[PDB]
Design a protein around this ligand. Structure first.
Ligand SMILES: O=[N+]([O-])c1ccc(O)cc1
Lengths: 182, 179
């Protein structure tokens, strides 16, 4: 379910992956080890499902978005897809959470890596778009990557605060407009 | 310093809220005696206001000042760039993985501030749509939601360590969607 993933998130957030036991998860979830396995799989399966739910910078979805034929469509796809994932979840995504005053160091390391891989993946997309010519020459790619990152996290914050989904989707469509299509 | 004292104060207020927090709670959490608390921060009220001013993303006074610019675009532009000028980690959300449940006092306060900010931008847009600078058809509701996302996202980027010059450039880009 959905409270189950939140429960798993809090544990992994505080303890990290390595230091979270099956026994921690069964106790927190209130189900036995075979039922945890039947519902969520191995601890690793459960951890990857938790990251699907709470990570802005999820690799597979970013990569799937980058395959679109223009940088604009790539970013558009990505931003609207995130809005689907983000929508009522009150914590925001994990980077939003890590940015608050007062995560386990393993989780800090994970977010730090994921954020920079996202930035670089977007920059690689921008580099290809300049060669293909759908990004105008002289585009500040570094600035534009940072803006895309700001847009994702900002849409996460709005979702977390309870913004209506059609309104947030309209906002993501406006945000994508900043990535030009020449 | 005691940038950190205010961090610890914020943690206690987040949990207990204002009314149920005593000086005796604060002194035992900050590890400092009340005269010291009075010298450094003032009354419980002053300390509360100080801690809120440190950690709230919504800066209404500087927002309202930005709105007095004659175009919707210029208003947003000066608000966004101005916001980055301050940033260089606020309570962007009303829930904490680590911190536990926020007191209902804190939830209400954060909700009101968010809503004030949104209304202020939405008004300015509605003003601008009549005054002529926003094209009729413009979705002012979606456009205000976008501005909120930009301001909080730039806030998250800044909190995560983004370089100043990149963030300023990102703000200027973000202002471009207000026609
Ligand atoms: O310097 N950079 O390019 C950065 C710095 C910090 C950060 O969180 C992301 C990117």
């Amino acid at each position: 379910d959905q409270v189950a993933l939140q429960t798993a998130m809090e544990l992994f957030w505080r303890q990290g992956y390595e230091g979270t036991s099956i026994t921690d998860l069964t106790k927190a979830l209130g189900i036995n080890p075979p039922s945890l396995y039947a519902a969520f799989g191995s601890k690793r399966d459960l951890f990857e499902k938790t990251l699907d739910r709470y990570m802005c910078e999820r690799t597979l979805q970013l990569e799937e978005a980058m395959v679109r034929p223009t940088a604009h469509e790539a970013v558009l796809d990505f931003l609207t897809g995130r809005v689907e994932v983000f929508t009522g979840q009150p914590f925001g995504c994990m980077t939003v959470q890590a940015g608050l005053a007062s995560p386990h160091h393993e989780i800090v390391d994970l977010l730090t890596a994921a954020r920079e891989q996202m930035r670089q993946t977007v920059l690689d997309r921008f580099e290809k778009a300049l060669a293909d010519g759908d990004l105008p020459a002289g585009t500040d790619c570094t600035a534009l990557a940072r803006y895309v990152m700001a847009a994702v996290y900002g849409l996460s914050v709005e979702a977390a605060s309870g913004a209506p989904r059609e309104e947030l989707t309209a906002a993501a469509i406006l945000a994508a407009q900043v990535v030009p299509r020449a």
